[PDB]
Amino acid sequence: TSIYPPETSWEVNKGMNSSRLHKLYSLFFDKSSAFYLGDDVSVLEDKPLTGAYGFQSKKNDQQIFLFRPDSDYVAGYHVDAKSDAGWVNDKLDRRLSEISEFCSKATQPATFILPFVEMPTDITKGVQHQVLLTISYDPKSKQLTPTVYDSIGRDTYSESLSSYFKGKYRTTCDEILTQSIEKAIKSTDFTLGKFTRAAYNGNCGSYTFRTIKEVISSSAQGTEVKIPGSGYITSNSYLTSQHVQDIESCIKYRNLGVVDIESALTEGKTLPVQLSEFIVALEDYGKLRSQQSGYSKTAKLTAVELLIGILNDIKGKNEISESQYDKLVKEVDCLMDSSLGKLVQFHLKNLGAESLQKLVLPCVKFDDTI
Amino acid sequence: TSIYPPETSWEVNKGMNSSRLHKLYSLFFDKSSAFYLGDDVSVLEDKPLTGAYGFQSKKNDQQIFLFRPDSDYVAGYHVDAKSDAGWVNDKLDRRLSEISEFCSKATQPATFILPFVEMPTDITKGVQHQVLLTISYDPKSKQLTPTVYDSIGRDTYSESLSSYFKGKYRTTCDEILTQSIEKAIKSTDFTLGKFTRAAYNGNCGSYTFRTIKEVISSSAQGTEVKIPGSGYITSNSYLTSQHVQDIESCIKYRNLGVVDIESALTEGKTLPVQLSEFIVALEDYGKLRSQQSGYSKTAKLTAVELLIGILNDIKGKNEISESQYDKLVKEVDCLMDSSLGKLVQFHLKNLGAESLQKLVLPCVKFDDTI
Ligand SMILES: [Ba+2]
Ligand SMILES: [Ba+2]
Ligand SMILES: [Ba+2]
Ligand SMILES: [Ba+2]
């Protein structure tokens, strides 16, 4: 929908979708964030490209178009190689056709970044798998080179698939994808570069986001660096602790408009956290905590009720009372406890207060002696 | 779709859907199964009821209608009690209206069994939760009594929701559901009995199936027996080992037509396992095993290839060779190994052979000396 609500009790291993990914896009101009791109400026209203955010290299003439993720960017493949290679969703195919059309007239070299999902359609229930397509066109060669970046793992000799059995089984959407790309060009104007697939090792989504950040930055120049066999040592150095906290904190604790994100990437901008986000995040915690899992559910709830109250009384033409501050001080230990704690900690860090007490201490009307 | 394919690597904790549940319906006339109903005969073409399978109590005049599960039998509820109670999907509402209409003219007492799914619509991503509606009409009282059976757990004093906070949060679809039911009757002909909800303690789906089996059988007479506070000791005695193996084996290892199921319940019938099911199950194992996780993937694959080959060569006008049997004997250890093993064991048990060797030993053309 139009907003991207805080999902408490979300974590990296709980999977990615298009909305989440688009929400993480907000991290690109955040300086506190390990995904920050200062390799780049927003583009030149110039030539935009529908469905994609445009970028000029602070170093280069090189233009970088990064597509907003889409639920319809998807490729089904048949595992059984007797069946047809598969399908691509029509929108994806459309963006391919549109890229082709963009490059047919373009002076400056470019790189197009299309996060998508690939899935087996042969399996009783298949897993949708988050991966990354990038197409790079250069005007001198008239040449497009497709490349696809994939997380899951690499070729353990046991789970190694035989050359023979490769004849009988597809593990990827590569065949249908190559077909879609060759199809997007017939001016026969473009000589197609060679299709390649890069692999590592549902955390895959997070890796994909890191890869987007990598791909863009890596156009400073050369040397595309992903975990195995080229570049980074392990996937801990690549997707790091700060990377993971950044992502989880964005998705878990914030509340973001699509408008805020599009405005944030269509010009260079950070999106500072509003107090209203803190209120919404609390509210959501509240609504969840009343079902699932010491500190009793009823205690946690009374606490969040009170804190919400104080939090938006602050927002209005008013300022809070001595007695309300008393209650809050009674509640800070419940509020700093565990998950709810990590929540209020996120928000205090971003509102610039050391504690709740510090946060609400000003805006207290004391006028009564005692 | 029209078929219910074997889902290898499915287990009880992986959740339920309507197709799976409908497939488990096949277990009701299976004698090897702990869900077998010999409390009952198929009904009397008589009055049928669309969307539901009819039943006459071998003991009674009491009629039992058990609805085929439906993806559209669903109820959304708002957790936040400031919002409206929720919605019911129109089909569900329709079946309610239709039950009401069935009872308005009915001589014999009846019980209607409607498995469905209830979910929070307020939560960023909600869990669809499998539960069970039953409505029992009696012609003397002109009275319908709704009852809903729910798995998740019961009222741990910590996670106990306060009477006050019950004011602020709904945990169930009860409000909207009661509303739908009262709505299905205005002849104001029926005096509505009191709405109740029974709870225990995504395994919930399996519990629901057991409950269906319970509810039906429990109409032998009286005493509805579910785990806590009434009836059974624990949920191990209620949903038992044989229950769980039965369900898992049905869903994991069989391949069943909707037609086979409807024919199986519209007359009293077992659905004996065909050899073709064994072939399909193997095929599916094969297609999965080429992605995910000693015995190498390539070994497992060569084995399943060979076994499939021998398995449907058997099916035709032909019978297998000495050399093929040699190969198979080489492969039985790979085939009996682990998961693939539990598969072939299921199928041998149901085809009446002690091993693969026993199974394929007849149908071998030996004509060559040596
Ligand atoms: Ba297409
Ligand atoms: Ba070529
Ligand atoms: Ba309705
Ligand atoms: Ba009443």
Coordinates of N, CA and C in Angstrom, one line a residue, chain A residues 54-175:
Chain A
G54 N 17.1 7.4 -10.9 CA 18.3 7.7 -11.7 C 19.5 8.3 -10.9
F55 N 20.7 8.0 -11.4 CA 21.9 8.4 -10.6 C 23.0 8.7 -11.5
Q56 N 23.8 9.7 -11.1 CA 25.0 10.1 -11.8 C 26.2 9.9 -10.9
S57 N 27.2 9.2 -11.5 CA 28.4 9.0 -10.7 C 29.2 10.3 -10.4
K58 N 29.4 10.5 -9.1 CA 30.2 11.6 -8.7 C 31.6 11.6 -9.3
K59 N 32.1 10.4 -9.6 CA 33.3 10.2 -10.3 C 33.1 10.4 -11.8
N60 N 32.0 9.8 -12.4 CA 31.9 9.5 -13.8 C 30.9 10.3 -14.7
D61 N 30.9 9.9 -15.9 CA 29.8 10.1 -16.9 C 28.8 9.0 -16.8
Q62 N 29.1 8.0 -16.0 CA 28.4 6.7 -15.9 C 27.0 6.9 -15.2
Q63 N 25.9 6.5 -15.9 CA 24.6 6.6 -15.3 C 24.0 5.3 -14.7
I64 N 23.4 5.4 -13.6 CA 23.0 4.2 -12.8 C 21.5 4.3 -12.5
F65 N 20.7 3.3 -13.1 CA 19.3 3.3 -12.9 C 18.9 2.1 -12.0
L66 N 18.3 2.4 -10.9 CA 17.9 1.3 -10.0 C 16.4 1.3 -9.8
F67 N 15.9 0.2 -10.3 CA 14.5 0.0 -10.3 C 13.9 -0.2 -8.9
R68 N 12.8 0.5 -8.7 CA 11.9 0.2 -7.6 C 11.5 -1.2 -7.6
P69 N 11.6 -2.0 -6.5 CA 11.1 -3.4 -6.6 C 9.6 -3.5 -6.9
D70 N 9.2 -4.6 -7.5 CA 7.8 -4.8 -7.9 C 7.4 -6.3 -7.7
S71 N 6.3 -6.5 -7.1 CA 5.7 -7.8 -6.8 C 5.6 -8.6 -8.1
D72 N 5.5 -7.9 -9.2 CA 5.3 -8.5 -10.5 C 6.7 -8.7 -11.2
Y73 N 7.8 -8.4 -10.5 CA 9.0 -8.7 -11.2 C 9.4 -10.1 -10.7
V74 N 9.1 -11.1 -11.6 CA 9.2 -12.5 -11.2 C 9.4 -13.4 -12.4
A75 N 10.2 -14.5 -12.2 CA 10.4 -15.5 -13.3 C 10.2 -16.9 -12.8
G76 N 9.2 -17.6 -13.4 CA 9.0 -19.0 -13.1 C 9.8 -19.9 -14.0
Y77 N 10.4 -21.0 -13.5 CA 11.1 -21.9 -14.3 C 10.7 -23.3 -14.0
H78 N 10.8 -24.2 -15.0 CA 10.4 -25.5 -14.9 C 11.7 -26.3 -14.5
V79 N 11.6 -27.0 -13.4 CA 12.7 -27.8 -12.9 C 12.9 -29.0 -13.8
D80 N 11.8 -29.5 -14.3 CA 11.9 -30.7 -15.2 C 12.2 -30.2 -16.6
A81 N 13.4 -30.7 -17.1 CA 13.9 -30.1 -18.3 C 13.3 -30.7 -19.6
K82 N 12.4 -31.6 -19.4 CA 11.5 -32.0 -20.5 C 10.4 -31.0 -20.8
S83 N 10.1 -30.2 -19.8 CA 9.1 -29.2 -19.9 C 9.7 -27.9 -20.6
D84 N 8.9 -26.9 -20.8 CA 9.5 -25.7 -21.5 C 10.2 -24.9 -20.4
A85 N 11.2 -24.1 -20.8 CA 12.1 -23.4 -19.9 C 11.4 -22.6 -18.8
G86 N 10.2 -22.1 -19.1 CA 9.5 -21.4 -18.0 C 8.7 -20.2 -18.6
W87 N 8.5 -19.2 -17.7 CA 8.0 -17.9 -18.0 C 8.7 -16.7 -17.3
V88 N 8.6 -15.5 -17.9 CA 8.9 -14.3 -17.2 C 7.6 -13.5 -17.2
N89 N 7.3 -12.8 -16.1 CA 6.1 -12.0 -15.9 C 6.2 -10.8 -16.9
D90 N 5.1 -10.4 -17.4 CA 5.1 -9.5 -18.5 C 5.7 -8.1 -18.2
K91 N 5.5 -7.7 -17.0 CA 6.1 -6.4 -16.5 C 7.6 -6.4 -16.6
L92 N 8.2 -7.5 -16.2 CA 9.6 -7.6 -16.2 C 10.1 -7.5 -17.6
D93 N 9.5 -8.3 -18.5 CA 9.7 -8.3 -19.9 C 9.6 -6.9 -20.5
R94 N 8.6 -6.2 -20.0 CA 8.3 -4.8 -20.4 C 9.5 -3.9 -20.0
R95 N 10.0 -4.0 -18.8 CA 11.2 -3.2 -18.3 C 12.4 -3.6 -19.2
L96 N 12.7 -4.9 -19.5 CA 13.7 -5.2 -20.4 C 13.5 -4.5 -21.8
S97 N 12.3 -4.6 -22.4 CA 12.1 -3.9 -23.6 C 12.3 -2.4 -23.6
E98 N 11.9 -1.8 -22.5 CA 12.1 -0.4 -22.1 C 13.6 0.0 -21.9
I99 N 14.4 -0.9 -21.3 CA 15.8 -0.6 -21.2 C 16.4 -0.6 -22.6
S100 N 16.1 -1.7 -23.4 CA 16.6 -1.8 -24.7 C 16.3 -0.5 -25.5
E101 N 15.1 0.0 -25.3 CA 14.6 1.2 -26.0 C 15.4 2.4 -25.4
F102 N 15.7 2.4 -24.2 CA 16.5 3.5 -23.6 C 17.9 3.6 -24.1
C103 N 18.5 2.4 -24.3 CA 19.9 2.4 -24.7 C 20.0 2.7 -26.2
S104 N 19.0 2.3 -27.0 CA 19.0 2.6 -28.4 C 19.3 4.0 -28.7
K105 N 18.7 4.9 -27.9 CA 19.1 6.3 -27.8 C 19.7 6.6 -26.4
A106 N 21.0 6.5 -26.3 CA 21.7 7.0 -25.0 C 23.1 7.3 -25.4
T107 N 23.6 8.5 -24.9 CA 25.0 8.8 -25.1 C 26.0 8.3 -24.1
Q108 N 25.6 8.3 -22.8 CA 26.4 7.9 -21.7 C 26.2 6.5 -21.2
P109 N 27.3 5.8 -20.9 CA 27.2 4.4 -20.5 C 26.3 4.2 -19.3
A110 N 25.7 3.0 -19.2 CA 24.7 2.9 -18.1 C 24.6 1.5 -17.5
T111 N 24.1 1.4 -16.3 CA 23.9 0.2 -15.6 C 22.5 0.2 -15.0
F112 N 21.8 -0.9 -15.2 CA 20.4 -1.0 -14.8 C 20.3 -2.1 -13.8
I113 N 19.6 -1.8 -12.7 CA 19.6 -2.7 -11.6 C 18.2 -3.1 -11.2
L114 N 17.8 -4.3 -11.4 CA 16.5 -4.8 -11.3 C 16.4 -6.0 -10.3
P115 N 16.1 -5.7 -9.0 CA 15.9 -6.8 -8.1 C 14.6 -7.6 -8.5
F116 N 14.7 -8.9 -8.4 CA 13.5 -9.7 -8.7 C 13.5 -11.0 -8.0
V117 N 12.4 -11.8 -8.2 CA 12.2 -13.1 -7.5 C 12.1 -14.2 -8.6
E118 N 12.8 -15.3 -8.3 CA 12.8 -16.4 -9.3 C 12.2 -17.6 -8.5
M119 N 11.4 -18.4 -9.2 CA 10.8 -19.6 -8.5 C 10.5 -20.8 -9.4
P120 N 10.7 -22.0 -8.8 CA 10.2 -23.3 -9.5 C 8.7 -23.4 -9.5
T121 N 8.2 -23.6 -10.7 CA 6.7 -23.8 -10.9 C 6.3 -25.3 -10.9
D122 N 7.3 -26.2 -11.0 CA 7.1 -27.6 -11.0 C 6.8 -28.3 -9.7
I123 N 7.3 -27.6 -8.6 CA 7.2 -28.1 -7.3 C 5.9 -27.9 -6.6
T124 N 5.4 -28.8 -5.9 CA 4.1 -28.8 -5.2 C 3.9 -27.4 -4.5
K125 N 4.9 -27.0 -3.7 CA 4.9 -25.6 -3.3 C 6.4 -25.1 -3.3
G126 N 6.6 -24.1 -4.2 CA 7.9 -23.7 -4.5 C 8.3 -22.5 -3.6
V127 N 9.6 -22.3 -3.4 CA 10.1 -21.1 -2.6 C 10.4 -20.0 -3.6
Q128 N 9.8 -18.8 -3.4 CA 10.2 -17.6 -4.1 C 11.5 -17.1 -3.6
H129 N 12.5 -17.0 -4.6 CA 13.8 -16.7 -4.2 C 14.3 -15.4 -4.7
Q130 N 14.8 -14.5 -3.8 CA 15.2 -13.2 -4.1 C 16.5 -13.1 -4.8
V131 N 16.6 -12.6 -6.0 CA 17.9 -12.5 -6.7 C 18.0 -11.1 -7.5
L132 N 19.1 -10.9 -8.2 CA 19.4 -9.6 -8.7 C 19.8 -9.5 -10.2
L133 N 19.1 -8.9 -11.0 CA 19.5 -8.8 -12.4 C 20.2 -7.4 -12.6
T134 N 21.4 -7.4 -13.3 CA 21.9 -6.1 -13.8 C 22.3 -6.1 -15.2
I135 N 21.9 -5.1 -16.0 CA 22.3 -5.1 -17.4 C 23.1 -3.8 -17.6
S136 N 24.2 -4.0 -18.2 CA 25.1 -2.8 -18.4 C 25.3 -2.6 -19.9
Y137 N 24.9 -1.4 -20.4 CA 25.0 -1.0 -21.8 C 26.2 -0.1 -21.9
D138 N 27.0 -0.3 -22.9 CA 27.9 0.7 -23.3 C 27.8 1.1 -24.8
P139 N 27.8 2.4 -25.1 CA 27.5 3.0 -26.4 C 28.6 2.9 -27.4
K140 N 29.8 2.5 -27.0 CA 30.9 2.3 -27.9 C 30.8 0.9 -28.6
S141 N 30.5 -0.1 -27.7 CA 30.3 -1.5 -28.2 C 29.0 -1.7 -28.7
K142 N 28.0 -0.8 -28.4 CA 26.6 -1.1 -28.7 C 26.2 -2.3 -27.9
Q143 N 26.8 -2.5 -26.7 CA 26.7 -3.8 -26.1 C 26.1 -3.8 -24.7
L144 N 25.1 -4.7 -24.6 CA 24.5 -5.0 -23.3 C 25.0 -6.3 -22.7
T145 N 25.5 -6.2 -21.5 CA 25.9 -7.4 -20.8 C 25.0 -7.7 -19.5
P146 N 24.2 -8.8 -19.6 CA 23.4 -9.2 -18.5 C 24.2 -10.0 -17.5
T147 N 23.9 -9.8 -16.2 CA 24.5 -10.5 -15.1 C 23.5 -10.7 -14.0
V148 N 23.5 -11.9 -13.3 CA 22.5 -12.1 -12.3 C 23.2 -12.6 -11.0
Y149 N 22.9 -12.0 -9.9 CA 23.5 -12.3 -8.7 C 22.6 -13.1 -7.7
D150 N 23.2 -14.1 -7.2 CA 22.4 -15.2 -6.5 C 23.0 -15.6 -5.2
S151 N 22.3 -15.6 -4.1 CA 22.8 -15.9 -2.8 C 23.1 -17.4 -2.5
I152 N 22.1 -18.3 -2.7 CA 21.8 -19.5 -1.9 C 23.1 -20.3 -1.3
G153 N 24.0 -20.5 -2.2 CA 25.1 -21.4 -1.9 C 25.8 -21.8 -3.1
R154 N 27.0 -22.5 -3.0 CA 27.8 -22.9 -4.1 C 28.2 -24.4 -4.0
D155 N 27.7 -25.2 -4.8 CA 28.3 -26.4 -5.3 C 29.0 -27.3 -4.3
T156 N 28.4 -27.6 -3.2 CA 29.0 -28.6 -2.3 C 29.1 -29.9 -3.1
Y157 N 30.2 -30.5 -3.1 CA 30.5 -31.7 -4.0 C 29.5 -32.8 -3.9
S158 N 28.9 -32.9 -2.7 CA 27.8 -33.9 -2.4 C 26.5 -33.5 -3.2
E159 N 26.1 -32.2 -3.0 CA 24.9 -31.7 -3.5 C 25.2 -31.1 -4.9
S160 N 26.4 -31.4 -5.4 CA 26.8 -31.1 -6.8 C 25.9 -31.9 -7.7
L161 N 25.4 -31.2 -8.7 CA 24.5 -31.8 -9.7 C 25.3 -32.2 -10.9
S162 N 25.2 -33.5 -11.3 CA 26.0 -34.0 -12.4 C 25.7 -33.3 -13.8
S163 N 26.6 -33.3 -14.7 CA 26.5 -32.7 -16.0 C 25.3 -33.4 -16.7
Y164 N 25.2 -34.7 -16.5 CA 24.1 -35.5 -17.0 C 22.7 -35.1 -16.5
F165 N 22.7 -34.9 -15.2 CA 21.5 -34.6 -14.5 C 21.1 -33.2 -14.6
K166 N 22.1 -32.4 -15.1 CA 21.8 -31.0 -15.5 C 21.0 -31.0 -16.7
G167 N 21.1 -32.1 -17.5 CA 20.3 -32.4 -18.6 C 18.8 -32.5 -18.2
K168 N 18.6 -33.2 -17.1 CA 17.3 -33.5 -16.6 C 16.6 -32.5 -15.7
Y169 N 17.3 -31.6 -15.1 CA 16.8 -30.6 -14.1 C 17.4 -29.2 -14.3
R170 N 16.6 -28.2 -14.3 CA 17.0 -26.8 -14.1 C 17.0 -26.4 -12.7
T171 N 18.0 -25.8 -12.2 CA 17.9 -25.2 -10.9 C 17.7 -23.6 -10.9
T172 N 17.7 -23.0 -12.1 CA 17.6 -21.5 -12.1 C 16.7 -21.1 -13.3
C173 N 16.4 -19.8 -13.3 CA 15.5 -19.2 -14.4 C 16.4 -18.7 -15.6
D174 N 17.7 -19.0 -15.5 CA 18.6 -18.5 -16.5 C 18.2 -18.7 -18.0
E175 N 17.6 -19.8 -18.3 CA 17.3 -20.1 -19.7 C 16.2 -19.2 -20.2

